[PDB]
Amino acid sequence: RGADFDHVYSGVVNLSTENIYSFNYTSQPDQVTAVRVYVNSSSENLNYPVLVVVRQQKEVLSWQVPLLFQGLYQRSYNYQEVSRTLCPSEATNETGPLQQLIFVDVASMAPLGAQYKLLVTKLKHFQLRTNVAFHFTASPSQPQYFLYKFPKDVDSVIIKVVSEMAYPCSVVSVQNIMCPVYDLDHNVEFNGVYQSMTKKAAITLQKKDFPGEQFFVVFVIKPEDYACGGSFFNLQRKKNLEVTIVPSIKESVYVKSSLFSVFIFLSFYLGCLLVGFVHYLRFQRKKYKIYFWNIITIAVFYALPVIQLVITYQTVVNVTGNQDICYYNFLCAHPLGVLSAFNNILSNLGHVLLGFLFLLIVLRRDILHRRALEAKDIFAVEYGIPKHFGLFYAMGIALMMEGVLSACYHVCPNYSNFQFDTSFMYMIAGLCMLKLYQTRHPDINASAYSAYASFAVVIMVTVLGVVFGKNDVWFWVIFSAIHVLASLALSTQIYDRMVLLVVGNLVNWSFALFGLIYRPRDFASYMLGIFICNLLLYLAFYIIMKLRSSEKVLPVPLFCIVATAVMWAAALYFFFQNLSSWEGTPAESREKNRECILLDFFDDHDIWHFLSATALFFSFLVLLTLDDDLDVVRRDQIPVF
Amino acid sequence: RGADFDHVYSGVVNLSTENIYSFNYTSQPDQVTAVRVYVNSSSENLNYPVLVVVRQQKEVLSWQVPLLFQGLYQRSYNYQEVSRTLCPSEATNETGPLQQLIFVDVASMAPLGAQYKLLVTKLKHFQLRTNVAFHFTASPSQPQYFLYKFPKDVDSVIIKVVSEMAYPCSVVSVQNIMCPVYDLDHNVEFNGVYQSMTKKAAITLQKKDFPGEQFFVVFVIKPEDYACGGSFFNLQRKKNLEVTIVPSIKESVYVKSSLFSVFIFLSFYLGCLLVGFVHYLRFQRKKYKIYFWNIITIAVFYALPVIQLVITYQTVVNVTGNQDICYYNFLCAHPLGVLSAFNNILSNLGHVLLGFLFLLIVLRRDILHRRALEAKDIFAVEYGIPKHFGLFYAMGIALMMEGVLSACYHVCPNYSNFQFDTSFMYMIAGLCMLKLYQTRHPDINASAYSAYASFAVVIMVTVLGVVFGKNDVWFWVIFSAIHVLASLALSTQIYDRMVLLVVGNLVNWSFALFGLIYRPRDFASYMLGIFICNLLLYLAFYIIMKLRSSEKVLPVPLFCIVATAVMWAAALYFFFQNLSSWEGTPAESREKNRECILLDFFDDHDIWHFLSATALFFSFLVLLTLDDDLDVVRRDQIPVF
């Protein structure tokens, strides 16, 4: 029967009568037309569903109305309105105008007839345009997909899908232009790239991956919300979606950002060179060695698991096309070669460059001291605090190792990797507190085993607390007992000294209270703030004790105190901007994704990598230079606190 | 049109003519009938395919002939014969006999008519019986599935599928009894458990998982062999398959095997008790302490990555139903609780029980030595070899830590976990060689860091060689250089002594040559044989040097030598029986799965865990007791080699 587009057809189908409709249309060359078939049935009997068959030249598509979904825990869902887009045939210029015919056959085996309504329409907005936002709606029984053709200049695009509400949750899949299109929840993840989506989704594609420089963006709504961190839930679950296809940054942005990263850090090298030059002009005109290596060994022992894991996770993402596995920022994930997010790795360059600079600065001090000790300078031998540079070498190397470990985490950030980003800073903050204590008490043995053992136990507490003590009121109660007791014990060792000890313990008790009351899910970041607080508290205690003892703070140490405080306040702010959350579902993390802040390449977490290295670098300089005033004062006179 | 079952229908379909067939059958209660629809079209034009629609009461099924598959690297496959089993409806006794009607509609849009052949048949062997082998055939375009109902007495079954040839490779999926059945490669992995299969597959199921105590066993043949370690490849890819449903072992087998494992090892405790009792009757009638703890720290540092990984892999297996992720011996993987293969973890009880026994043996001699020294015994003080039991405590605790590390690996053995099965044995073999050298050269410092560092570097070489040096002629050439040079340097320090050194280098050179020519993919096991070989060579050198120096081998040490040699020969044999291979694909590894050898619970790899612990336990006793004859001899008179 000849039928018209955009015309709603009603009918009753029983065993005897089947209703057939014929739609003929012409597709002009270089023009793609998609036909959407909508059938709905208001029939109580699901024992006798309305069966819809759409036959085209090269394909037959069949479905049933009401569409039934099997839910978790034996939940049943039925969708009375079912809509499908028929795979489009694109006429090349050579083929010419193509006359195509669609047959929509409607049948039912019901003894009394079952009613249905049919609307077949042509999609006027099937093709998606660049930098244009398109708003649409999808349902579990009404999946939608659209066509995008890569423009010549554009060699890569990002697919940004936004929703106002978290649920129902969807799947955004990118597939090549070949029939069939997998737009059902039972085959959508078979082919191509896909992401789970509650509120936001971002898929980055390259032209070389797709033949014909075109793809289909498929939007499938799940009958239930379980895979996307939701409780559950026969009635329309319409999701209002907006999708925009934006070109990615050009290769020039990669060059400008890599140069910027190296240059800000190399600027520090120039600044150290200028200071060194002034001393050279003045000169002409006028806790051990197994520690540098130990930090390496500990880092390598710790790097091996993550690196082996990276391979396997990277493998599974590439094959399955599951962008769910790695918790990238997505909105600012910039790919170089294999790396999905090169920008994250590049941000860790400062840790390596700044850590290296520190080793060179420490070395000059060691070489100069050693030369002075040989010359038997009175000041080198008997004036000032005895100088040991071993912990300083470990600190510099640890900063570099932190950069490498953080970069490894960023190859695939996820639940198995969560610790590695900020963990080595527990070692960095731990080493810095020994250097403070060793300054006055240079008699502390400090075995290599003790560092390795402490790190292992601290990480053991960290990983165990995240996995098994996620939010339990029990775990946080026990941990608060250790935290407070550790603070009491430490305070008595490292420490008006009494008033300072009270302030010192109180800050730790306050932190324990915040943790107990708030129960943060990110125990790794909470554990990190425990080491940062105690590092800054002991550093502040040292400065206060230095002032009460009338010891001076020279301009070079004093500037580093201001820079350390300013950089720590700035770095912590960018640390508190959560752009992805491995504790939640992949769809929940993606709601936190943001467009990146600096040079269109670096996000808030990238700035935290720049500023954490600079804050840690300037913290090293405070320890290195603070007691340089005493170099004139006799060691005998020098007090001990 | 009324049509007959098991009758082949021919017809020509053009735009004008569609051919419709009606098949009616009666399903008796408590009787399941499945109908298979076969359509084959020998039509050159794939632009105009034959479209087949099979409509039933509940659902409608449609497909096209020839069936087209999109292959990797743009390969195209077409199958003129397509066959499908229609979702059976099971009549309960209450419903009674049910008269069901099937409509098979055949259509084509070809201008000249396209021929087809149709056979609709009822499957007389749809239901699978217990302990009965059923042989069938499946094709990429002709998937098959069958029904199994759990017997009342049987609470769990294993699905064993066997094929004579590796390719074409298949997917065996287990799904609940609900329509639709996902029997296509684009939806087979959506629901239920599934395994990839080349030659063998084994799926273990429990009755509690399935409602109705029934499931579908779905067999889907892949159009290509890539996922199963093979290459490409329009023509039938028929796979002859045999599937048997066998009940799993009863809970009594779990109890009898757990008791056996504890008892053989506790028997050793009784044997040590009997020896201790005889000495107590005789008595009445007449390289340091930071090492025990260090091995713990190293093991914990090493246990943390694997344990965190276990959680995430175990998660993904449970959700997706993908049995391909872990590399168990599925033919004897027995589950207890959350563990998929409990027998693999129980087999590691020998390490902890025999490692604990050795610590009690060392402790006695440590206590009796200190008690003597307190009593100023002449023989304890000036006769015999200086006694340092510190490395014995490390060896005993390392054996325990190897049992827990090997048990953690067997929670989910895979490519990310490879090292954990045998890596700590490198530590054990290395500790045992230091104890040998420390015996006649008591003045060796042996720092804790050195053990940790050596382990880290040795594992770094092991993991790097497996991942990046899989079979390269380059990597094995460099490694043979280190292996020859390391053994050449070691031979000079520890080793007619000259003839022995020559024999000692030839064995290492031979091992290197075997590796160089053979290029084993399992570098972890090859690395293990390097440590075992040198441990037994240095042990044999010590015995030979003991005999040439006219020093006796007492009966207790001498028995341990025989037991160590016999157990090492026996353990190595069960080590060479590869029942699973993480280096290959999951389907390739399943080809080596075997039914398990001992008590219907333990396979060849489980026996290697029993015998490796016993060989390592008796190796410890050789070191502990060998020089107990020198206790009467004065320390000065004792030679050093």
Ligand SMILES: CC(C)CCC[C@@H](C)[C@H]1CC[C@H]2[C@@H]3CC=C4C[C@@H](O)CC[C@]4(C)[C@H]3CC[C@]12C
């Ligand atoms: C690994 C990171 C967290 C740094 C850890 C530093 C701390 C926790 C480690 C490193 C050095 C260690 C100390 C080394 C020296 C001594 C003095 C000794 O008589 C008692 C142990 C004690 C007090 C150790 C306590 C723990 C210790 C302070």
Ligand SMILES: CC(C)CCC[C@@H](C)[C@H]1CC[C@H]2[C@@H]3CC=C4C[C@@H](O)CC[C@]4(C)[C@H]3CC[C@]12C
């Ligand atoms: C905060 C972390 C990272 C670093 C803390 C350094 C701590 C662990 C170190 C530095 C100084 C050390 C103390 C130095 C002096 C003494 C006195 C001695 O009779 C007992 C050990 C004791 C009490 C040490 C315990 C460990 C100690 C307190």
Ligand SMILES: CC(C)CCC[C@@H](C)[C@H]1CC[C@H]2[C@@H]3CC=C4C[C@@H](O)CC[C@]4(C)[C@H]3CC[C@]12C
């Ligand atoms: C988790 C937070 C709140 C507390 C962390 C406590 C950690 C840093 C403390 C508690 C127990 C400590 C260990 C106690 C025992 C030893 C042996 C000794 O040779 C010093 C190192 C070592 C290994 C200590 C390292 C530091 C240590 C692990």
Ligand SMILES: CC(C)CCC[C@@H](C)[C@H]1CC[C@H]2[C@@H]3CC=C4C[C@@H](O)CC[C@]4(C)[C@H]3CC[C@]12C
């Ligand atoms: C704020 C937290 C992380 C600091 C934890 C470090 C402090 C409290 C821990 C770490 C290592 C611990 C020390 C480990 C070993 C010794 C030597 C022993 O003879 C006295 C106790 C003493 C000195 C412990 C005191 C508490 C201790 C110093």
Ligand SMILES: CC(C)CCC[C@@H](C)[C@H]1CC[C@H]2[C@@H]3CC=C4C[C@@H](O)CC[C@]4(C)[C@H]3CC[C@]12C
């Ligand atoms: C895993 C295996 C190789 C462990 C073997 C450990 C023992 C047997 C080996 C490994 C390192 C070796 C030592 C390496 C360096 C020296 C310093 C030299 O001036 C005397 C010999 C001595 C002390 C060697 C003795 C033998 C030695 C201790």
Ligand SMILES: CC(C)CCC[C@@H](C)[C@H]1CC[C@H]2[C@@H]3CC=C4C[C@@H](O)CC[C@]4(C)[C@H]3CC[C@]12C
């Ligand atoms: C089987 C082959 C690959 C093993 C080779 C191991 C070699 C390369 C590694 C493993 C253990 C390592 C040693 C561990 C202990 C020490 C003592 C330390 O004070 C200096 C480094 C030194 C000397 C290391 C040198 C390199 C080393 C000998």
Ligand SMILES: CC(C)CCC[C@@H](C)[C@H]1CC[C@H]2[C@@H]3CC=C4C[C@@H](O)CC[C@]4(C)[C@H]3CC[C@]12C
């Ligand atoms: C752990 C597995 C992989 C192998 C273990 C090897 C251990 C036991 C061996 C291998 C390398 C050896 C060290 C190599 C370096 C030296 C030289 C000298 O300065 C003291 C002995 C010492 C420190 C050796 C001690 C024993 C040692 C650490």
Ligand SMILES: CC(C)CCC[C@@H](C)[C@H]1CC[C@H]2[C@@H]3CC=C4C[C@@H](O)CC[C@]4(C)[C@H]3CC[C@]12C
């Ligand atoms: C694999 C078989 C052959 C055993 C391997 C023995 C290795 C681990 C042993 C044997 C010879 C040893 C080396 C001999 C020479 C030295 C002394 C000093 O310069 C540092 C340790 C170092 C470098 C040793 C490291 C460990 C060593 C390389």
Ligand SMILES: CCCCCCCC/C=C\CCCCCCCC(=O)O
């Ligand atoms: C004197 C104060 C020193 C600095 C204290 C810092 C306090 C940090 C405490 C933990 C907060 C963790 C919860 C929210 C942060 C999440 C980290 C992230 O977004 O990646």
Ligand SMILES: CCCCCCCC/C=C\CCCCCCCC(=O)O
């Ligand atoms: C004197 C000889 C001492 C013992 C030497 C043992 C030799 C072992 C060498 C490596 C063989 C590795 C290749 C095949 C074994 C695979 C291990 C496995 O099946 O799990």
Ligand code: NA
């Ligand atoms: Na099913």
Ligand SMILES: [Zn+2]
């Ligand atoms: Zn980071």
Ligand SMILES: [Zn+2]
């Ligand atoms: Zn094992």
